[PDB]
């Protein structure tokens, strides 16, 4: 089971969503700004995508 996507860092948020939904079609994807503080609960269904101000992925996406 794929749970991290380091190959998506530096890609557009759009391509990252498409790729993650191919691997995990029921993922609950939420896009947040990189450099924010976030809740530390663990959600096996969730993938947060942290984007820079250009809307590119700025941190390795992972399940949780």
């Amino acid at each position: 089971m794929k749970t991290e996507w380091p190959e998506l860092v530096g890609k557009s948020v759009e391509e990252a969503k498409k790729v993650i939904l191919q691997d995990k079609p029921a993922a609950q994807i939420i896009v947040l700004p990189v450099g924010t503080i976030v809740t530390y609960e663990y959600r096996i269904d969730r993938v947060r995508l942290f984007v820079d101000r250009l809307d590119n992925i700025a941190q390795v996406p992972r399940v949780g």
Binding site: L32, G35, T39, Y40, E41, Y42, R62
Partner: protein, 281 residues
């Protein structure tokens, strides 16, 4: 009838309750997404919101702050669950919006509010992968001012020999808390590193949710409020103990588990922490 979630029993909070200590008159700020003050198993004493577009700290549009609050302080009655410190004075310090995120300046503003309002304990079930000088200054200021500051370690799992503890947990002044299950095994998602201080239950933790609900959540976010609640129990039994002393009491009386890189000092034991003389069990 009320149920006692396993994690409350696992840290030995019922021993303090039977001695008559429940966190009365201890002020605990839950710095988080808000707390649903209408929940019949919570009593919220006060609070403030630092989120520009969500000005009511007593409306929790995410659910996370309400769950964390119930592990700290769900009321002792005939309903719902029981908190670690069910008599604590609970403050909703809203610094995260509905989506579970906040700007560093919102978190800092909430920490400053807590210091200005004489909070005895802060719980931060939250973090980010990088620090900032201003964030470090805010937590160091709260500690210098006498506040016990507790934070979730993060859910980044392992990464070889690298620390994966988040900030502000990773700062020396903050107690960083990892997650174990009911068998004392580290949760696979629990962050690791030399900054991990103690562990508490963080798997399938039942607590309060908005709109008079209950449910089981997972995370170091769930482990942190066991330790913040334990700090409130300790202060209710020893009201003159400093934050320094409360922190050492928890660290010095854990049940040691595995290697400290993965487990820190082990599982907290609030019964042993609240005695005068401290040793590990």
């Amino acid at each position: 009838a009320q149920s006692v979630p396993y994690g409350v029993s696992q840290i030995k909070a019922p021993a303090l309750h039977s001695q008559g200590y429940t966190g009365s008159n201890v002020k605990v700020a839950v710095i988080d997404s808000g707390i649903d003050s209408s929940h019949p198993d919570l009593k919220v004493a006060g609070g403030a919101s630092m989120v520009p577009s969500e000005t009511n700290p007593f409306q929790d549009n995410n659910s996370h702050g309400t769950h964390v609050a119930g592990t700290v302080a769900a009321l002792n009655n005939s309903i719902g669950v029981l908190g670690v410190a069910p008599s604590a004075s609970l403050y909703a310090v809203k610094v995260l919006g509905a989506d579970g995120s906040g700007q560093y300046s919102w978190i800092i503003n909430g920490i400053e509010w807590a210091i200005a309002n004489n909070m005895d304990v802060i719980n931060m079930s939250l973090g980010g992968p990088s620090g900032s000088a201003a964030l470090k200054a805010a937590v160091d200021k709260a500690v210098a001012s006498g506040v016990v500051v507790v934070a979730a370690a993060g859910n980044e799992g392992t990464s070889g020999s690298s620390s994966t503890v988040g900030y502000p947990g990773k700062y020396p002044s903050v107690i960083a808390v990892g997650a174990v299950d009911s068998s004392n095994q580290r949760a696979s998602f629990s962050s690791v590193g030399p900054e991990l201080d103690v562990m508490a239950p963080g798997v399938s933790i039942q607590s309060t949710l908005p709109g008079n609900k209950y449910g089981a959540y997972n995370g170091t976010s769930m482990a942190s409020p066991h330790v913040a609640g334990a700090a409130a129990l300790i202060l209710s039994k020893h009201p003159n103990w400093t934050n320094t002393q409360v922190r050492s009491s928890l660290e010095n009386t854990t049940t040691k588990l595995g290697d400290s890189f993965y487990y820190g000092k082990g599982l907290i034991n609030v019964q042993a922490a609240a005695q005068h003389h401290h040793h590990h069990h």
